[model samples]
Every structure is written in structure tokens, then in C-alpha cells.
Target: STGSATTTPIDSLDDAYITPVQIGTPAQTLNLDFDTGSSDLWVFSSETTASEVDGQTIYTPSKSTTAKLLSGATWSISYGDGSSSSGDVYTDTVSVGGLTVTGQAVESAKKVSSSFTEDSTIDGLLGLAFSTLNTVSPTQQKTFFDNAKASLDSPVFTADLGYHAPGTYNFGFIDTTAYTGSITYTAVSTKQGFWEWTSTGYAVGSGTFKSTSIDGIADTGTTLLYLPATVVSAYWAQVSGAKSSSSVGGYVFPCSATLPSFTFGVGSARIVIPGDYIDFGPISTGSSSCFGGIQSSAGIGINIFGDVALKAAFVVFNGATTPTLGFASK
Candidate 1:
């Protein structure tokens, strides 16, 4: 049977989306970040030191009779944001929505970086990337989606990431009602273990769409959209009060600055990011300073089409041959 699940954002941190996932025999539910950027199913667990636990929930393998330890296996993962986690491994039945994967590798964390511990709402991460990116040492492990795809009617999933609102993730089947208009499919290059693609062209506001090809990855775990340095500068140039701020580590502008819509081309279809979405809210609660939602991917080698861009369109992650990305307006 096909699987589908609804995901909600942590109101405080609108950076990531959290979905409920069941691990083990008796089904211990964990609120996990469904990250398309990384591939590893890891969770805070009994193995974690009390000092490192904070207010996040932990998974107890001992409570599940079906949980089996993968002796000598360990996993360590570091993210682009400098957050890291390491843990032992267990094989158990993991369920999402109505689909179940038996003997799925579940990494139980023994240690986590302060970024994770301080963010008490995120109990774990459910990676949706290719299994080739899994970090389990000795031998890599497959993600729940990887293990369950063969049983699915179709090897595909759709991510409906909402802005400050609840969204849904669907697996094995396409729900046409979830989006509007027709889906424009683009070929993806998974050689880098990411859903990487090149946009035909882009434009700022109502300006001309330059035939500049941009290579980037569609990353759900990332909060902001990252483009080449020149492209980022050009977009902010349109804003009257926008300036690159060393203090903000990116571009910051007055909260009331008039912003322009950013558009990216996918095949013949053009996805437009509204001016308001580019505002990205205020930098500080009481401050009039605001951070640009789109920034330069200078440090990172490749540009990233993150949440800021994804939430503007309905996205389909096609796991079928060649791995394609389909986008449509919502």
C-alpha cells in the first residue's frame, strides 16, 4: 500500500518541518525532521547522555522487543550548518503513514551537537535522500524510503512544505489535488547524492530572464535559498535600503523596503517567489532589520534551492529511473 504523512513546522523555528515516525515493535513515535538534504535515520535515544538530552524525547530500544542491535556498527553525521550527531545502530520496524519497513536501520544517538540539544523540539531526523549518502560505519544503511520503495506501486514521493503552516508528504502515489496547474519535470543529477539540477534561467522582479544556467540542489533541510554571489547581489540591488551586513553575515535591509519577485525557470515553466517571501521576517523580534531569504552560496560549492524556494512551489521527488524533479504551483 502507498504511504502518506502530514508534517508540521515548529512555530518557534520555521526552518524545518517535523513529521511523526514510528520506530520498533510497539511503535514509539518520534517527531523527526524530514530532511531531503541528508540520508540517515537517526534519533535521540536511551544511549544519549542525560546531560546531552535536554528537553527532547529519546528512543528506548530496550522497550521494543523487536529491536536488534547491529553489533560494531556506528554512525556519525555532520551537516552544512555545522550541526553533528553520532550514534549506535539498531534494526527495527519503522513505519510512516500507512507503509511499514521491517528491519530498517535506526541510528540511536549517543551524542549530539549543542545545536540539536538546544532545539528541544526536534527529536531526530528522518533523511529522505539517497541511501548512498547514509553514514553508518562498517556498512552503510538504507533509509526507510529506500527499503520500502520496492513494495510501493511507484517509486516517488512529493513534498508539500508550507510556510508557517502544516503540510503533507506523500509516498508511492501522486495526489494531483495537492497542487495546481501541470507539473513541469526537470532531469536531476544524483551523482552527488543530492537532487541536483540546473535551472534554465532566472530573473529578478519583472526584469529580463537571463540565460544564465545555475547548478543547484533542492534541499528541504536548509531554510534559505542560496544562489551564486553575483545573482544574490543583483537581486538585493533592486531593494533601495538593502546592504550586505557583516553583522548579519548576509544581506540585510529595512523591514519596509520594497522587494521584487524572484523567478526561476524549470524547463518551460517559471516558478515565481513572491516579494513578501523574500523578506524572510525581521532579523530580531523588536528590530526593524530584516534578513534576505535568498543569499550567496559562497562557502558551499553548489547553490541550494532550499525551503524559501521550495515552499513557493509544489515539488515531486521522482525516484524512478534518472530521478526527476517535478514542480507545480500550489
Candidate 2:
């Protein structure tokens, strides 16, 4: 039974933000993020100071009634965006929805940069993508899934994006009531948490563009999907005659037109890309379209299918069992 996980704020250190849920018996609130890019959970602590952070939500162990610190352990992580943070090890009674689990491994950040320390809204990100990509040290870390699975009524976990509808993030078991049809399952790639596959190319409306078929990775941590210059240019061509402008960082199109819909071929599944995502903003403003959101990276080897893509599908990251992902209609 997919239920809902109600979220509240916790005491975060270093000005880092965190969204927490009370779980299980003898409840412990744990900080988490709905990250589709990586698979892991981390928090902040007393070791963190105000000088070393930015754009991140921090957690304070001293404020929690059930805080527990791990002795002689340290945890640190750096993301591809060049943002990084690290801290000491700790544990506590962690909870989500109505379920509670004990002795979960967590990290308290002692140092963070302004890049991740500025956000006051979401404290920390919950990487609900897949298991293999978990960043915790196997020796000292046990992921949220590993800790809560046994306590959950069902082994299934669901993420409700609508919680963030007016802009709220909700977690917990799958909400079966949200969808009318059966779930679609996609095999996990041999790589990390990334969804692996070569795109068949991009198509706008009924006209298919002459673009290069490329390998793409679906990620929730990223805001926009990045495609090769060829694909970006081809898609932009269908929407408008405008070329890439240096000022805006990437190509811009008239946001006013009923922007064409683009689709990507993922294995046997096809995902539709909305026009609003393509049009930059408004034409009256500058004859501008949505920032195709795709950027040109000359030597960057991978194509990313960011949150824009995940918003269109219901993804289930099954980590408790064989480390697989399930997709369903929401």
C-alpha cells in the first residue's frame, strides 16, 4: 500500500537545509532529498560552521530529542556540479511517513560551500533514484532503504511529485490511487543510477529532425536535459529560425508559439517532452522561446535526461531487492 510521507523541518547546522520525516516506533526524524540523480541520504551537524557553506539545507543534531552520533567515523561527498560537502558520522531514530527505524547511518556536514549552503527551503536531497549509485561508505553507511525496508508494510517505495505541486515535496510508499493503469518496468542499467540507452533521435510535432542518436542518462538531480549540439540545434530549428546566442548561454526560441512537442525513445518506452520546457519565456519580452534547456558541451561525454524528463513519468527505484527501477503512470 503506497502511503504519504508528511514532511517538516529539522534543526540544520551550517545554514544547510533539510526536509525530515518521522519514522517508525520511538520516532527519529531524518533529512532527505528527492534526488533522481544519485541514490543516498545525508545530513548536517555541529561539525559544520557558517563559513564553509551555501545553497544547502543543514541539520543540527543537538536540536533533535533522539540524536545519536557515530564515534570515529567521517563522511564526505562531491557532486558533478563541482559542489561538495563532508562531515562526521552519526545515527539516530529515523522516520518517514508513519514508519520509524533505528540506528540508521548518517553524516553531519562540518564544511560546505556557498554553492550548496544558500537554500533555506529544502534542507537536504533524498536520492530516490536507484541503489547501485549509493555514495555511502559500505564500511560505515547503511542507506535509508536498507534501514526502513524491514519496517515498511510493503517493500515498495513511491515518490509523489504532486506534493511539490504548488511546490511541496512528499515521500513514502507508492500511492496506488494516483494512477489508473498498471506499472511499467524498465531494467536497471549496468552502470550506476543513470538510466542508460541510446536515443533514437528527437522529433517535433510530426516532423522528425535530422539529429544524431545519442546515449542519454535520466537524472532527477539535474534541472534540464542536456543533448548533443546536433540534437539541440535540430530541435530548436523546428521551433524557430533563431540560432544560438552567446549572451543567454544557449539558444533561445519564441516562448509564445504553441511550441512543438518533442519525444525521446528510451529502450521500448517513449517519453514526451512538453513545449513549455522548450520555449524560453515570452515573445513580447524578447521574441524569446523557452531555453531548450539543452546546452552544448564540446567534450562532455554523456547526455542527461534531467528532472524535466522524470516529471513526465512515475519512477520507482527498487533498491531493497535486486537493485532495479520500476516505472508507472501517475
Best by TM-score: 1
Regions of candidate 2 where Cα sits further than 4 Å from its true position: 1-3, 6-32, 52-58, 129-140, 162-173, 193-202, 208-215, 245-247, 279-290, 296-299, 328-330
Error of 1 at 160 (Å): 0.7
Residue-wise C-alpha lDDT for candidate 2, range 1-330, written one tens digit per residue: 123553332221111123466532344444565565665566544467876544444466666666676777765677767777776766766655445556866567777656657654554556555556665554546566556666666665654332123212333456566554656565556475565545656676677543456676656566566787876776677754556878766766655556666676544455566665444354234554545555564455777766555555565655445555555445
Best by lDDT: 1
| Cα TM-score per model | 0.97, 0.76
| Tens digit of per-residue lDDT, candidate 1, span 189-267 | 9898998999988899999998778999998888889999999999999998899998888999898888899999998
lDDT against the true structure, per candidate, is: 0.90, 0.56
Give the total clashing residue pairs for model 1. Answer: 0
Give lDDT: candidate 2, residue 53.
46
Candidate 1 positional error at 304, Å: 0.5
Error of 2 at 59 (Å): 2.4
State how far residue 295 of model 2 sits from its true place (Å).
3.9
Q: Where is model 2 poorest over a 10-residue stretch in terms of lDDT?
A: 8-17
